A paper describes a structure:
The assembly (folding and membrane insertion) of OMPs is mediated by the heterooligomeric β-barrel assembly machine (BAM). In recent years, our understanding of the mechanism by which BAM mediates OMP assembly has advanced considerably. It is now clear that although BAM is composed of a variable number of subunits, BamA is the major functional component and is sufficient to catalyze OMP assembly under very specific conditions. Unlike the β-barrels of most OMPs, which are extremely stable because their first and last β-strands are held together by a large number of hydrogen bonds that form along the entire length of both β-strands, the first and last β-strands of BamA are held together by only four hydrogen bonds that form at the β-strand termini. Biochemical analysis and cryo-EM structures of BAM-OMP assembly intermediate supercomplexes have revealed that during assembly the BamA β-barrel shifts from a lateral closed state to a lateral open state and thereby enables a conserved C-terminal motif in the substrate (the “β-signal”) to bind tightly to its first β-strand (BamA β1)25–29 in an antiparallel configuration.
For two of the structures, we crystallized the BamA β-barrel bound to darobactin and then soaked in either CP1 or CP2, and for the third structure we co-crystallized the BamA β-barrel with CP3. Our x-ray crystallographic analysis shows that, in contrast, CP1 (B, pink), CP2 (C, yellow), and CP3 (D, teal) bind to the lumen of the BamA β-barrel. Unlike CP1 and CP3, CP2 binds primarily to strands β3 to β7 and does not form interactions with residues at the lateral gate or the BamA C-terminus. Three CP2 sidechains, R5, R11, and S12, interact electrostatically or form hydrogen-bonds with BamA residues E470, D512, and N492, respectively. Like the interaction of CP3 residue R4 with BamA E470, the interaction of CP2 residue R5 with the same amino acid helps to explain why the E470K mutation suppresses the toxicity of both peptides and supports the idea that their antibacterial activity is a consequence of their interaction with BamA. Instead of locking the β-barrel in a closed conformation like CP1 and CP3, CP2 might inhibit BamA activity by constraining its flexibility and thereby preventing β1-β8 from folding outward into the lateral-open state. Indeed, both darobactin and at least two of the peptides (CP1 and CP2) can bind to BamA simultaneously. The darobactins bind to the BamA β-barrel seam by forming an extensive network of backbone hydrogen bonds with BamA β1 that enables them to function as competitive inhibitors of β-signal binding, offering an explanation for their broad-spectrum activity. We found that over the entire course of three 50 ns simulations RMSD values for both peptides were consistently below 2.5 Å when compared to the crystal structures, demonstrating that they were bound stably to the lumen of the BamA β-barrel.
Numbering used by the authors:
A (entry chain C): 2 to 16
B (entry chain A): 423 to 676, 699 to 726, 730 to 807
C (entry chain D): 1 to 7
């Protein structure tokens, strides 16, 4: 969820 | 005007996953969509408050701002134990380039709180590179960092359709680099590609090629923090292997081998998949496929000379491989993916997990 | 599964 467009990933499994 | 949501999923890697959110588009007439969202699974909890204007300019340049928190428990993600509680804020700008390409650039602040670290070589080597020297005989420790980063991304999407694509490509490139003033000093880049090539006229026989590349490293004598490591293994990378199992394993301090994955600063995943028509009754709701998955995770700073009695974790050539069958279906409980795969190339300490599934 | 209700 945290790394969805247009955000950088902040959670493991979201890169 | 607004909306709210709650979701429940289930998968082999995440266990039961929960999701909840409240969104108010055009909150107070500001032109900004305000969202409060949270996720929780077996190893991680995430929450954010976002403020977003998809039309920051009348041409579609978007602006996003958020406050976030993340709690990650590494033993629950089948890694060597540590707790990483983080919080921060991100500001991001999205730029439409054309129909298929968008760019993004942003600035981020994150505070990381590391604790419950079971002393191990790679982790302790990173800590030593930061000027930190915690005890190697106990898990009673604390390590805090504050990082300022420049973030960027590129998304390419020319798929014929979003659900069950048959033709075209999806490319996602992400990057980040710390800004002077951060405790950490590193960069990290990711590239994901998916390409669907239809064989027949009716697009019922499709070839999917997928790649995943990850590389990060420290600038100066500092290393990339282990809590930014890449992982491989599981339903979304190399099927037939337990989540995050591929790559380096922890070497604990009493010199102590193990099968607990730690991740690494370099990763490469590749996959060839043949989507075929679903056998038995027929047809647009089921996707059957046969795959060949491969992947490797390594530690470029692993000192093999100092630890010659251990496997060389800086070696990228330990390519894991698996073969199997997958089934996708839009079920009344959400999207469903089931796979049965067999690791036909594994290395010491790798954990196998033949049947894998995800719901939602 | 995901349930979503507007207001
Ligand atoms: C409340 C509606 C959103 C206002 P702004 C959203 C910024 C996101 C990065 C508009 C800034 C324009 C220059 C800033 C608000 C400050 C507290
Ligand atoms: C770094 C992007 C590589 C894309 P591929 C290149 C094919 C040659 C033109 C290889 C994917 C893994 C096997 C696309 C495969 C499509 C079926």
């Amino acid at each position: 969820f945290s790394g969805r467009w247009x955000w950088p990933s902040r959670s493991v499994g979201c890169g | 005007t607004g909306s709210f949501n709650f979701g429940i999923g289930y998968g082999t890697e995440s266990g039961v996953s929960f999701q909840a959110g409240v969104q108010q588009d055009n909150w107070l007439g500001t032109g900004y969509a305000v969202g409060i969202n949270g996720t929780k699974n077996d190893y991680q909890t995430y929450a954010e408050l976002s403020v977003t204007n998809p039309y920051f300019t009348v041409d579609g340049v978007s602006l996003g701002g958020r406050l976030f928190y993340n709690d990650f428990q590494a033993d629950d993600a089948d890694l060597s134990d540590y707790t990483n509680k983080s919080y921060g804020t991100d500001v991001t700008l999205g730029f439409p380039i054309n129909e298929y390409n968008s760019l993004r650039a942003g600035l981020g602040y994150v505070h990381n709180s590391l604790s419950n670290m079971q002393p191990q070589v790679a982790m302790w080597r990173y800590l030593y590179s930061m000027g930190e020297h915690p005890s190697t005989s106990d898990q009673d420790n604390s390590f805090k960092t504050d990082d300022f980063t420049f973030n960027y991304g590129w998304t390419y999407n020319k798929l014929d359709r979003g659900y069950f694509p048959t033709d075209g490509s999806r490319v996602n490139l992400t990057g980040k680099v710390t800004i002077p003033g951060s405790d950490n000093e590193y960069y990290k880049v990711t590239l994901d590609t998916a390409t669907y090539v239809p064989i027949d006229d009716d697009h019922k026989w499709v070839v999917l090629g997928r790649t995943r590349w990850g590389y990060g490293d420290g600038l100066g004598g500092k290393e990339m923090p282990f809590y930014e490591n890449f992982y491989a293994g599981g339903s979304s990378t190399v099927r037939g292997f337990q989540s995050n199992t591929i790559g380096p394993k922890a070497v604990y301090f009493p010199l102590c081998k193990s099968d607990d994955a730690v991740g690494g600063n370099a990763m490469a995943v590749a996959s060839l998949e043949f989507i075929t028509p679903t056998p038995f009754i027929s047809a647009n709701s089921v996707r059957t496929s046969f795959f060949w998955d491969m992947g490797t995770v390594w530690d470029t700073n692993w000192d093999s000379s100092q630890y010659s009695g251990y496997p060389d974790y800086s070696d990228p050539s330990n390519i894991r491989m698996s073969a199997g069958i997958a089934l996708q279906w839009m079920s009344p409980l959400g999207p469903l993916v089931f796979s049965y795969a067999q690791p036909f190339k594994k290395y010491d300490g790798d954990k196998a997990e033949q049947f894998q599934f995800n719901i939602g | 599964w995901n349930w979503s209700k507007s207001f």
